[PDB]
RNA sequence: UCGAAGUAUUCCGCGUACGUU
RNA sequence: CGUACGCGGAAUACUUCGAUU
């Protein structure tokens, strides 16, 4: 059966990914490492007091293997710049290519940011068009005039 | 309870507006009237080779949805159209209808010639709800 | 921020069924 | 395109619980 590429074991591993350093071998469409605060840094921030935030949430699913990123976001022109590469049509093309073949599923990106959040979702088949909507809605989030 | 701002008869209504359309009069986000073909008109358009008859798109306040199916043929004159479905005022308005002071999740989703976009977000969000969602409509309706 | 549970919706993919608007 | 399901996920809102006892 090739649907290991879809069976949960490559579903908890897409999971694991975000904390793992790919342990297994298992491919990321993220091309930077996720950066989520601790507890403690995340209620010690939390002073003053849901506006500007540390950072934003995003993941990328192919069928039911998703693969999750909390980076840090500053608001700066240099930081947006750093967290648009985190991931690439390349980077999520070759991933995909991992965990797709014969039946279409259904692909999704979703980002949330200031308490917006952003879905771009579809069939596999139509994964180009999601990764050109994807970058261009992250981009539009993250400039969201407050 | 007595909430009648997010209950099931006006969940009813509001799904009912987009045929009704307007019946009883309930308050719609959308400020054009529904254009969804019928079986047979997207038979012979699809039996003609891409390119879809329009798009589908909807605002949600809570458990309260409204759907509009409109025409859209890659024009500039179709696109000015279309975006006119609503507004920043036509949403807030209506929404102002269906909320309390109790925070619930609200939602723009729309599909356009495979892709599906989907802005949400609390209650106390829909002003930026609005903003991203004009945005993603103008971009997925263009490329 | 992380994990888990419930509740109320929506979205996508797949499959089935029924249609004159 | 519309309606009704069934399956598999995801997203949002609200609620509860745990996170170098």
């Not at 599923?105 to 771009?120: A, D, L, N």
Request: overall charge neutral; aromatic content about 10%; glycine content about 10%.
């Amino acid at each position: 059966m090739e649907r290991a590429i879809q069976g949960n074991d490559t579903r908890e591993q897409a999971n694991g990914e975000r904390w793992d350093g790919g342990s297994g071998g298992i491919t990321s469409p993220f091309k930077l490492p996720d950066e989520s605060p601790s507890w403690t840094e995340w209620r010690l921030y939390n002073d003053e007091t849901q506006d500007n935030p540390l950072g934003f949430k995003e993941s990328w699913g192919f069928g039911k293997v998703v693969f999750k990123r909390y980076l840090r976001y500053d608001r700066t022109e240099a930081s947006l710049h750093r967290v648009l590469g985190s991931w690439t049509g390349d980077s999520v093309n070759y991933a995909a290519s991992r965990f797709l073949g014969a039946n279409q599923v259904g692909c999704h990106y979703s980002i949330r940011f200031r308490g917006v959040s952003v879905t771009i979702s579809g069939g596999s088949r139509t994964l180009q068009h999601l990764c050109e909507m994807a970058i261009r809605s992250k981009q539009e989030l993250l400039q969201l005039t407050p």
